[PDB]
Amino acid sequence: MLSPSEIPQRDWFPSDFTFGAATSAYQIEGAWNEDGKGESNWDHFCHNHPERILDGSNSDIGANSYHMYKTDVRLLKEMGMDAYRFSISWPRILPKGTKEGGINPDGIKYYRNLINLLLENGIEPYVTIFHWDVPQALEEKYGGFLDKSHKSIVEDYTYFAKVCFDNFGDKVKNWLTFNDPQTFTSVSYGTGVFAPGRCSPGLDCAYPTGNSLVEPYTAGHNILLAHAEAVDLYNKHYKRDDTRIGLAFDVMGRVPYGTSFLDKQAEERSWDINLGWFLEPVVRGDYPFSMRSLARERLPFFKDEQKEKLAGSYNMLGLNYYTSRFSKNIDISPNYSPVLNTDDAYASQEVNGPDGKPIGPPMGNPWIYMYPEGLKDLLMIMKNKYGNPPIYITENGIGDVDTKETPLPMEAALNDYKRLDYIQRHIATLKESIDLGSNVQGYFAWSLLDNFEWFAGFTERYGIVYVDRNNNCTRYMKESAKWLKEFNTA
């Protein structure tokens, strides 16, 4: 849909800029109980109540990347990708979650083999330590990130990070402690659509015996205390001049719904609760003012020693960006009371503006609307407000819908011109943002592979490479992957 002169070229970007693709462990690996790996929260979730995954599926196999990793690397290599973002499975390294439980030599060997193979193919590993797959042994012991002591999860996570640094840090120069913290907390413990599926009594989820106005914030502050300890560890013993550590935030761009100053206020509260929640702690050592004023006692306080450790705890940062929303003011009044942690923004997040028209063209699935300007907005915030740190777009993509009711022919799934156009426009926005002074240094397409998309299961294909599950998870390059190959190698 873009004109030939508006199509991004690789020479639009500095030679040290990084293009890559991304996955996560639970979503692609399979081999859930093989070679000494312990159960995760998502394993027990999918399997004690398969009715809570939309299509009744799980990731026992996924894309079978534990066995098929050589082909993943082959595909990355063919496409000329500079880098690959994958995560390490906590229960695969440490089946009981703990130093007690001991290190699983086969887990270590897997990621060691993946890493060496990527590097010998000139592909830089960007390693996410944790992508939502908490060892089930830790969930039963103390609730995982719901840990009320705010110490046990912190120590256990830190030791896991230690193991990763100790076994992979010679070769891995780019670490991310967490990925998508706002989605993990808000969806797992707020709406409870994600494992372990907890929400306030009354709401529709597997375990409605939590608190959607509190538990997301509890899990969130444990995440922050854990990243701060791991970075503290990393800086003391493992940081070298050419290595970097950070974390990756999910963020939906925010635009004022109408012309009123109230909606500008709503917009700012929405950036704050989505981006600011986890960003502002790692930048300055505390949550956004707005969240503290609105969540109040539901948002725990950091101790002074914790603030020091948190502030400046990154060398780089990731942004996971898919879409944007219009933010519309809600007043404080006796006519309104927050139900979900995200309602503490006092702003409704609308797809359609005042003219009835969507913010951008719909990309196929329930929630992605194409709005590359919001990516630009986000980058200008990071630039002008939060010190312009080194930024990677660690996720960007769309999901093609493919279900029993409405199956997607393989020819149409491979002819993914919607995805291709979406990717091109967003890469073009990075060009525009760099020119404006953004310190963005790379871009990762979300989903190297069609994979298990959490609640959506296999109903959404986010891959630039198709995975044929009817066969033996055979990979086929889509048009998007073919364009990326041309782009990277020209």
Ligand X SMILES: COc1ccc2c(c1)O[C@@H](O[C@@H]1O[C@H](CO)[C@@H](O)[C@H](O)[C@H]1O)C(=O)N2O
Cβ-based nearer residue to ligand X, 154 or 379? 379
408-442 per-residue burial string, b: 16 or more CB within 10 A, e: under 16: beeeebbebebbbbbbbbbbbbbeebbeeebbbbb
Give the other-Cβ count within 10 Å of 67's Cβ.
16
CA distance 94 to 108: 10
Cβ-based nearer residue to ligand X, 27 or 158? 27
Min dist CB 252 to ligand X, Å, is: 8
- Radius of gyration from C-alpha coordinates of the chain: 21
Q: In angstroms, what CA-CA distances link 454 with 40, 43, 50, 240, 363?
A: 13, 11, 12, 36, 19
Contacts of 9 (CB under 8 A, 6+ apart): 487, 490
Cβ-based nearer residue to ligand X, 62 or 389? 62
The residues facing 135 across adjacent strands are 40
Q: Say if residues 267 and 256 touch (Cβ distance below 8 Å).
A: yes
**What does the chain come to in residues?**
490
Q: Which two tokens stand for residue 264?
A: 């500008």
Cβ-based nearer residue to ligand X, 108 or 251? 251
CA distance 31 to 29: 6
Cβ-based nearer residue to ligand X, 26 or 302? 26
Min dist CB 254 to ligand X, Å, is: 14
Q: Which two tokens stand for residue 229?
A: 């300890």
Min dist CB 489 to ligand X, Å, is: 26
Q: In angstroms, what CA-CA distances link 398 with 406, 440, 463?
A: 18, 21, 8
Cβ-based nearer residue to ligand X, 24 or 441? 24
Cβ-based nearer residue to ligand X, 24 or 222? 24
Looking up tokens 């995760």 gives 40
DSSP per residue, 229-275: HHHHHHHHHT--TT-EEEEEEE--EEEESSSSHHHHHHHHHHHIIII
Cβ-based nearer residue to ligand X, 218 or 320? 320
Give the up-direction half-sphere exposure of residue 410: CA atoms within 13 A in the CB hemisphere: 11
| Helix pair angle (65-78, 105-120), 10° resolution | 10
Min dist CB 193 to ligand X, Å, is: 5
Q: In angstroms, what CA-CA distances link 249 with 13, 156, 273?
A: 23, 22, 12
Cβ-based nearer residue to ligand X, 250 or 344? 250
Cβ-based nearer residue to ligand X, 187 or 199? 187
Q: Say if residues 354 and 215 touch (Cβ distance below 8 Å).
A: no
Min dist CB 350 to ligand X, Å, is: 16
Binding site for ligand X (CB under 6 A): 24, 180, 183, 187, 193, 250, 320, 395, 446, 453-455
Min dist CB 70 to ligand X, Å, is: 23
Cβ-based nearer residue to ligand X, 163 or 445? 445
Min dist CB 47 to ligand X, Å, is: 18
Cβ-based nearer residue to ligand X, 18 or 183? 183
| Helix pair angle (215-237, 181-188), 10° resolution | 150
Given the DSSP bridges, would you call strands 474-477 and 460-461 parallel, antiparallel or unpaired?
A: unpaired
CA distance 232 to 157: 13
Min dist CB 294 to ligand X, Å, is: 20
Contacts of 290 (CB under 8 A, 6+ apart): 268, 269, 272, 273, 276, 345
Looking up tokens 């230690």 gives 162
